[PDB]
Amino acid sequence: QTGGSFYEPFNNYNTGLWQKADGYSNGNMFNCTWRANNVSMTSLGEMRLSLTSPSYNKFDCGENRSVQTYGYGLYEVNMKPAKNVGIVSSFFTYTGPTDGTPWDEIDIEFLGKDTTKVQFNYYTNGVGNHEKIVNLGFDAANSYHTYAFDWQPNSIKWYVDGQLKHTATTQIPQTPGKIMMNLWNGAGVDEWLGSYNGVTPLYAHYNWVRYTKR
Numbered sequence: 001q002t003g004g005s006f007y008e009p010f011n012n013y014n015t016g017l018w019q020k021a022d023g024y025s026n027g028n029m030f031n032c033t034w035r036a037n038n039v040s041m042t043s044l045g046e047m048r049l050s051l052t053s054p055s056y057n058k059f060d061c062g063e064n065r066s067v068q069t070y071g072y073g074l075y076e077v078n079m080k081p082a083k084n085v086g087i088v089s090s091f092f093t094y095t096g097p098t099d100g101t102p103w104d105e106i107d108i109e110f111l112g113k114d115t116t117k118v119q120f121n122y123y124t125n126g127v128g129n130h131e132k133i134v135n136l137g138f139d140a141a142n143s144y145h146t147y148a149f150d151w152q153p154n155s156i157k158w159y160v161d162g163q164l165k166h167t168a169t170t171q172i173p174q175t176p177g178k179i180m181m182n183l184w185n186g187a188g189v190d191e192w193l194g195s196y197n198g199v200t201p202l203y204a205h206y207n208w209v210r211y212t213k214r
């Protein structure tokens, strides 16, 4: 890994820690194009991701990613996801083929269709299917909450406001990855996310991020 512990309050946009995806679509289930203009800072000290439309039936989305790689340790995010059918707001670690490594990823994803729930998942050497849906007891879209994952060699623990919500112990990822955040509308996954209805603009806000090395 190339990165160390850090605390990001989002008082400004630190180009030394982050970079914006721009000018391309992930393809597959992503029905939008990443644009640097879709990642911006608010006056209230927050990073905001947006889902907008530049023309008929075309969508623009946002993705923020870290410059360095991070390994084992505690990952915390204080955020508020977007609320709307057919979309996803997330916080995850990622590394893959493009980077010349196995596909190792750990996720925290909010299905816009129902913000009273949260989904946890992970990929190890490209193998996923570890989805775990948890009831939050509140509407994540209404206020800020702290979401976290403790990534250790033999286990992954997920928390909501300090409370342990789920643990994973098999086929734990090992490759350090970049910290990422995104907001997007899907296609071909109606059963999972619901059918996107074209409503824009939509926003996901990030208050602060923290990574504490092992």
Ligand SMILES: [Ca+2]
Pocket (backbone or CB within 6 Å): 009, 010, 011, 044, 045, 046, 206, 207, 208
């Ligand atoms: Ca802040």
